[PDB]
Amino acid sequence: APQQINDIVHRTITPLIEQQKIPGMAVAVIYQGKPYYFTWGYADIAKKQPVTQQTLFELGSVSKTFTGVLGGDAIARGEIKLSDPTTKYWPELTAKQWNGITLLHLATYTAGGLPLQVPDEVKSSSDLLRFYQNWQPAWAPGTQRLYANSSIGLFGALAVKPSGLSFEQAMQTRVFQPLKLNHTWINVPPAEEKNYAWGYREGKAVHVSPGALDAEAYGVKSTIEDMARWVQSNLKPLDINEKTLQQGIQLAQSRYWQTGDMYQGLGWEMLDWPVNPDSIINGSDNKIALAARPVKAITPPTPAVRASWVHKTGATGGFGSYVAFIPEKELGIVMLANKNYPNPARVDAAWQILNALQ
Numbered sequence: 174a175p176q177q178i179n180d181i182v183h184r185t186i187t188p189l190i191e192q193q194k195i196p197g198m199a200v201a202v203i204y205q206g207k208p209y210y211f212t213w214g215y216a217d218i219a220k221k222q223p224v225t226q227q228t229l230f231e232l233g234s235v236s237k238t239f240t241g242v243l244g245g246d247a248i249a250r251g252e253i254k255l256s257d258p259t260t261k262y263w264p265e266l267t268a269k270q271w272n273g274i275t276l277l278h279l280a281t282y283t284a285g286g287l288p289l290q291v292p293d294e295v296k297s298s299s300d301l302l303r304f305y306q307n308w309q310p311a312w313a314p315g316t317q318r319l320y321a322n323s324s325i326g327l328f329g330a331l332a333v334k335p336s337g338l339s340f341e342q343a344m345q346t347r348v349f350q351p352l353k354l355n356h357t358w359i360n361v362p363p364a365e366e367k368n369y370a371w372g373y374r375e376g377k378a379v380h381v382s383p384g385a386l387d388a389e390a391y392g393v394k395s396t397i398e399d400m401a402r403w404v405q406s407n408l409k410p411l412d413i414n415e416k417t418l419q420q421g422i423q424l425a426q427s428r429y430w431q432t433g434d435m436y437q438g439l440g441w442e443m444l445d446w447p448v449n450p451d452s453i454i455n456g457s458d459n460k461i462a463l464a465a466r467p468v469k470a471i472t473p474p475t476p477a478v479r480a481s482w483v484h485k486t487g488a489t490g491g492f493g494s495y496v497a498f499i500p501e502k503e504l505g506i507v508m509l510a511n512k513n514y515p516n517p518a519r520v521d522a523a524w525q526i527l528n529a530l531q
């Protein structure tokens with residue numbers, strides 16, 4: 174690799190791993206259409222398996238970027254519209270609070286205060302109807318952003334209905350296959366368990382538990398190589414041969430709402446480049462708190478802006494993830510770790526790395 178990339182990465186991540194006590198980590202720097210990969214430590218501490226470029230990490234909420242792009246692809250295929258009422262795709266959702274609630278609202282956490290998690294007690298389709306029917310919004314739709322797996326989760330399940338496919342089958346055939354993401358899974362197959370890192374929470378090996386709408390919200394597992402290939406796809410969507418996917422990518426990085434310096438996409442979140450990293454490390458958008466934030470409608474949404482810092486953070490109980498990229502500079506980073514560690518620390522490291530290379 175270029176020494177500059179070697180040097181800044183090792184100098185940023187090595188202290189990070191020490192301070193946060195991360196068992197294993199994988200990083201990709203994507204620069205001018207080329208990836209550069211770094212690994213540290215252990216996928217499996219007990220079996221002394223090292224992190225490699227084929228190690229699978231749980232992405233957590235970075236999964237939502239796939240969901241965003243899959244939904245944007247369904248839009249480009251003419252199957253759904255973000256302006257459509259939720260009840261168009263789920264007519265059994267007859268409770269009156271759902272009047273005015275669109276697929277845009279679900280996709281961007283603006284439905285009016287959908288809760289962070291689908292409850293664990295929700296298992297069947299009947300349970301899921303019951304849960305959504307019985308939810309009472311705090312706010313009118315399109316007024317406040319509150320981050321929620323139950324919001325974008327439902328968006329993901331409804332977006333694929335007209336296709337005829339299960340979410341998993343739609344994602345595989347429409348996003349993973351076309352982009353050649355061959356080591357990216359919603360369900361890790363027995364053949365790949367050898368590559369699947371354990372997460373560590375309080376020093377215990379853990380994997381993400383099954384739950385309603387897990388695939389759509391936090392359930393994707395991937396390797397650093399496939400994740401770099403994902404960053405490259407989102408950095409240069411016009412290089413993509415499949416027209417509805419290329420368009421779906423652009424729809425996912427479009428700006429639908431503003432709060433402070435952040436713009437809400439479909440899965441992806443954006444700031445204007447150059448960025449002052451204080452809001453995303455120290456201030457209102459550092460993700461420490463679950464934050465109800467009034468939003469300004471971007472009417473109509475701004476098409477994907479090249480001069481953006483585009484990012485998404487994710488966690489499961491055992492894992493911490495981060496992806497950020499600047500299409501203008503043809504520059505991106507993926508950071509995958511098998512311990513959940515504070516988001517500000519993730520963003521601080523990413524910023525130091527990309528600010529130095531840009």
Ligand SMILES: O=C(O)c1cccs1
Pocket residue numbers: 285310311312313314
């Ligand atoms: O105005 C409305 O639709 C609402 C106010 C509070 C919950 S929904």
Ligand SMILES: O=C(O)c1cccs1
Pocket residue numbers: 203206207208398401402403404405
């Ligand atoms: O796998 C590949 O060719 C690439 C991943 C990121 C940029 S190019």
Ligand SMILES: O=C(O)c1cccs1
Pocket residue numbers: 320460461462463464
């Ligand atoms: O985007 C947000 O507000 C959050 C992501 C994770 C916790 S809060």
Ligand SMILES: O=C(O)c1cccs1
Pocket residue numbers: 431432433467468469
């Ligand atoms: O800049 C503005 O007017 C607003 C940001 C968030 C709600 S309104």
Ligand SMILES: O=C(O)c1cccs1
Pocket residue numbers: 407408409410411423426477478479500
């Ligand atoms: O090339 C472009 O216009 C873009 C790449 C990513 C968002 S817009």
Ligand SMILES: O=C(O)c1cccs1
Pocket residue numbers: 380381382384391488489490491
């Ligand atoms: O089991 C886990 O780690 C999680 C379940 C839902 C979000 S993370």
